[PDB]
Symmetry: C2
Subunit: 206 residues, 2 copies
């Protein structure tokens, strides 16, 4: 399996953490210079034509991180708990994955992408949208050990890829007491969290 990725990208780290939690080896490919000038057409035809992350699983090309995550869980997961077969439990994981995309990651990108990439001036309205998303996450976690069920699921892995980036960027999570409790308890439970998520945060800590 080839894994086209950027180490700092939260969705890439979400997929990397999923592969680690499933004990899946992937051949990591770095898509840094894929937009640089003078790359051969033969090299361009191998590049993912859509978004990063993309996997190539024996010819099966798949983009969209959360679709990759549920594909890996079912195709390669030994047990149930990361993406339960039970339809009600699975539905809640799916629900939380849509929330992760449309609220949490969206708010992260809306605020930090203009700043980090374009060196733009902070948008206070977009900044508050992070807190709005985090307030929803905090409510999901009230009285819960995990974000979408009684065990760690794919939704924990996808959400942690963004929440850990927020903390790496000095966003204070303390007032989201359930988010803080969950984030502290989840990191030691995530296989190879340091290798496949924390290490890729370095660009943000800088």
């Amino acid at each position: 399996m080839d894994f086209y990725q950027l180490p700092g990208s939260p969705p890439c780290r979400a997929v990397a953490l999923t592969a680690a939690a499933l004990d899946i080896e992937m051949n990591f490919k770095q898509v840094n210079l894929m937009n640089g000038e003078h790359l051969k057409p033969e090299f361009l035809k191998i590049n993912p034509q859509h978004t990063i992350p993309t996997i190539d699983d024996n010819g099966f090309r798949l983009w969209e991180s959360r679709a990759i995550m549920t594909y890996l869980a079912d195709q390669y997961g030994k047990n149930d708990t990361l993406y339960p077969k039970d339809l009600k439990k699975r539905a809640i994981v799916n629900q939380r994955l849509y929330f992760d995309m449309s609220s949490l990651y969206k708010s992260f990108m809306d605020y930090y992408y203009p700043i980090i990439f374009m060196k733009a001036v902070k948008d206070q309205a977009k900044y508050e949208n992070i807190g709005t998303a985090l307030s929803f996450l905090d409510k999901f976690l009230e009285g819960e050990n995990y974000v979408a069920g009684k065990n760690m699921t794919l939704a924990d892995l996808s959400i942690v890829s963004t929440v850990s980036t927020l903390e790496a960027l000095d966003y204070d999570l303390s007032k989201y007491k359930n988010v803080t409790r969950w984030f502290a308890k989840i990191k030691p439970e995530i296989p190879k969290y340091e290798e496949y998520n924390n290490a890729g945060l370095k660009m943000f800590k800088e």
Copy 2:
């Protein structure tokens, strides 16, 4: 099964079309006056506390239209084709569902919600985002009968709930030749399309 819905809402119609395609009866509930003054607390406690659509399936509460759709397909679908069990085919349906949410429906709402609801002035930048999303959809449909596989799937039903709304609002689809071909061929194949989608477009045609 109770179905908390608004007839004009594309995500509500996507769920309604899914239930029809699966031959699922639902008890439709209209959430019109749920924000009106002087509704009893006993009535408010039954109201969905999150977003519309919401189903209540024998006590199991589920919001997020695309999570509802995949839940209904697996829990109540007699056959495979609407949401194939095959993991690669299922992954592509899931991928297209995320696209539907994050590009197609997002672009529809960004442009039409301020206009329709707040009577706001048109945003030309947001208008062009619809064409951008439709251009991606048109590419997915190149050489294809359906948006996410060799048969009609949940992704066709979710996407048609927004594409049909665009046409009802006099958005011209002709230049998206694959979207136009797909839209024309899909409507006669969708069970009870008239009852559960076309009828709810009336507010937009007006």
